[PDB]
Amino acid sequence: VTCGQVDANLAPCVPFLTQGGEPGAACCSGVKTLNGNAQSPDDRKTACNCIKAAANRYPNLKDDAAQSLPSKCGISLNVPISRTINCDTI
Amino acid sequence: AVTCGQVDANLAPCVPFLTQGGEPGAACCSGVKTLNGNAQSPDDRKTACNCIKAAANRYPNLKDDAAQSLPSKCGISLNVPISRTINCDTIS
């Protein structure tokens, strides 16, 4: 996994993550794809650091949307979308 | 607008509820909210109605009562009915 792959997977989620509402089907599909790449501990740590940079990338990101994205998409997300996540604990 | 692929993808988490009953999940209610939000114009609503109709007929074990009660169980006012047999021309 690479940070560009992660960015591409999270792109459809930016409207939901910065404006609220509901994640679209495209957003949930991208998150599902990225979750499928974060299997191994090293994949999980790398994807986590990429997701952290991406989260800090988007302005006025709403943490309620980030926290509720896994339940709104039906995913047990192995890498949380946080600006402040310590990826070593993943 | 809305496309049949969007309708399929948003209603997919609802298939367990639509075929077995019970309660709709969080993902199902989220997809139903998204579909409600994409059906803005009356033309969007008729297009969505035909897509949802195809999706409903896709499962031969679909419970029409669960389809009818899905919006209320989710707390959503869905502007397009979910029916296997609806004539989508008669909707507004």
Ligand SMILES: CCCCCCCCCCCCCC(=O)O
């Ligand atoms: C069960 C709720 C029925 C919705 C009909 C009332 C109209 C409000 C939303 C209808 C379709 C959305 C279009 C819009 O709000 O511009």
